From a paper:
We further stabilized frPanx1 by truncating the C-terminus by 71 amino acids and by removing 24 amino acids from the intracellular loop between transmembrane helices 2 and 3. Purified frPanx1-ΔLC was reconstituted into nanodiscs composed of MSP2N2 (an engineered derivative of apolipoprotein) and soybean polar lipids, and subjected to cryo-electron microscopy (cryo-EM) and single-particle analysis. We used a total of 90,185 selected particles for 3D reconstruction at 3.0 Å resolution. The map quality was sufficient for de novo model building for the majority of frPanx1-ΔLC with the exception of disordered segments of the N-terminus (residues 1–10), ECL1 (88–100), and ICL1 (157–194). The frPanx1-ΔLC structure revealed a heptameric assembly, which is unique among the known eukaryotic channels. The Panx1 permeation pathway spans a length of 104 Å, with constrictions formed by the N-terminal loop, Ile58, and Trp74. The narrowest constriction is surrounded by Trp74 located on ECL1. We observed that the distance between the guanidino group of Arg75 and the benzene ring of Trp74 from an adjacent subunit is ~4 Å, suggesting that these two residues likely participate in an inter-subunit cation-π interaction key to Panx1 ion selectivity. Mapping such residues in the Panx1 structure revealed that they are clustered proximal to the extracellular constriction by Trp74, in a groove formed between ECL1 and ECL2. Based on the lack of channel activity at 0 mV, our current structure may represent a closed conformation.
Pannexins are a family of ubiquitously expressed large-pore forming channels which regulate nucleotide release during apoptosis, blood pressure, and neuropathic pain. Among the pannexin family, pannexin 1 (Panx1) has garnered the most attention for its role as a large-pore forming channel responsible for ATP release from a variety of cell types. Different kinds of stimuli have been reported to activate Panx1 including voltage, membrane stretch, increased intracellular calcium levels, and positive membrane potentials. Like other large-pore forming channels, each Panx1 protomer harbors four transmembrane helices (TM1-4), two extracellular loops (ECL1 and 2), two intracellular loops (ICL1 and 2), and an amino (N)-terminal loop.
Author numbering:
A (entry chain B), B (entry chain A): 11 to 87, 101 to 155, 169 to 170, 195 to 357
Write the structure that this text describes.
């Protein structure tokens, strides 16, 4: 009985290439973080070529600096801040979106990695020794992960943070779009604190926001992409209803492994671990041999 | 008896991946250092596009440079320095926050690393040889760390430095917010030292601070994030009341290891070492075998 409990070695950097994120979470994260960076890079580029935020039509009686004053004054205060702070909300949401994958990498990745390596090495050993009564090591190990919750708790944490951030960004951009595309100019007053009773200046002045066009374009692009990537976040968040293949069911054609009685797919570590195992089954060497073998029969 | 005291080798770069910081301290440090850098990067970017700090409405009778003089003069002196020095306090607190993890890395990390490697190699040897009377090497070694204090002293040093810096930054930003969001302009005088009795200049002039909006936004963001990450610092600082799993209790199902009588969780090196051991138990190979083994029984 107890002979295949002795730990010998990993006889290589054998795995070195396990994937610890299910490729859809990976694509979604890359896109959602990258898009605002490209947008605001272009934004800052064009704004540093324009070299101004607004332009006011000052009266000729002013000098240079006397007009620069009103042009700087009217850049301060219907909300104008949804325009003043646009290139900052995007960086903010980009960084907030980068955070959850850091959370994953530092709190769940190494545990999951060790578990995957253990299960895979055990399966390879079992097949290799029984192709030529022991205890169901892998069966009992996977039975242990049937009332724990840490892995799935952390997973759902990451997914819900991502969904919340994307939803908020969407409604912000939407209000921007539905508010600014009706005009781009406004009336500004200057004589307020000391010049209040100074008749040497106009009672009003006009100024125009000179980036509304580009910002509206970027808003449309970002909103479309985000509403496109929301459903994938939800489909990922629905773990116990995804599509699997039961690699543990392909392994049951050898003399003494198991016969998996019946699953239930509840929210627990068993389901998430099975998902990661199926994603990484590309590296299990014995898998293809057993597949063709059960095909011959 | 004395046979398992001979040092043979680490038969690989076996561990090469121990984690020397408990993932919550890691996340907190990354966030707290990174956030002000992103904020002040954006600040310096926008301020170099604006190319000015204030704007004063000089009388038309001035020339160009004669108005530049008042515009530069009134940028000097209710505190205006809380506005003048804003992009510097943030870099200061970022660097002060980076310091404690350097302190940890240089005074505690290598000792802890050697200790972890020793304990883990010893446990693996013990299991591997007794799965097929000796002295409790690991039990006595962990007994030695029961009246020393260096590790926990350094740990608490780092945590309290972090908490102090975060608290001070919070109250600074709070005073900024509660002071500047009532106005953005002030009255300035010029004729003071030589032009005092020079009637060729106005008795007053107005100037406006042209970054109050952006700085207030950054202040809100930073204050919210810092008050969010304070509780985690405290929860970390409360070492002897955290949640563990007693991996040394899972190891006691083999013939001659121990039976852990009773803990007390006082402030000492034993508790902190147990925390680090539980964090790094992902690499102990025998751990999962023993877990499934005690499950079968």
């Amino acid at each position: 009985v107890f002979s295949d409990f002795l730990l010998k070695d990993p006889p290589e950097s054998k795995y070195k290439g396990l994937r610890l994120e299910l490729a859809v979470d990976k694509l979604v994260s890359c896109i959602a973080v990258g898009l605002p960076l490209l947008l605001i890079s272009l934004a800052f580029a064009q704004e540093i070529t324009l070299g101004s935020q607004i332009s006011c039509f000052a009266p000729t009686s002013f000098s240079w600096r006397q007009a620069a004053y009103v042009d700087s004054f009217c850049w301060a205060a219907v909300p104008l801040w949804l325009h003043k702070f646009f290139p900052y909300i995007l960086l903010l949401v980009a960084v907030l979106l980068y955070l959850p994958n850091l959370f994953w990498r530092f709190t769940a990745a190494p545990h999951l990695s060790s578990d995957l390596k253990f299960v895979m090495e055990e399966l390879d050993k079992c097949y290799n020794r029984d192709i030529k009564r022991d205890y169901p090591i892998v069966e009992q190990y996977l039975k242990t992960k049937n009332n724990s919750y840490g892995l799935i708790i952390k997973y759902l944490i990451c997914r819900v943070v991502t969904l919340i951030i994307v939803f908020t960004a969407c409604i912000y951009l939407g209000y921007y779009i539905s508010l600014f595309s009706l005009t781009d100019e406004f009336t500004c007053n200057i004589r307020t604190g000391i010049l209040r009773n100074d008749t040497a200046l106009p009672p009003l002045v006009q100024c125009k926001l000179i980036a509304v066009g580009v910002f509206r374009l970027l808003s449309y692009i970002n909103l479309i992409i985000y509403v496109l990537i929301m459903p994938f976040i939800i489909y990922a968040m629905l773990v116990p209803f995804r599509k699997t293949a039961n690699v543990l069911k392909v392994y049951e054609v050898l003399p003494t492994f198991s016969v998996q009685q019946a699953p239930s797919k509840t929210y627990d570590d068993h389901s998430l671990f099975l998902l990661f195992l199926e994603e990484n089954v590309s590296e299990l060497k014995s898998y293809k041999f057993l597949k063709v073998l059960e095909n011959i029969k």
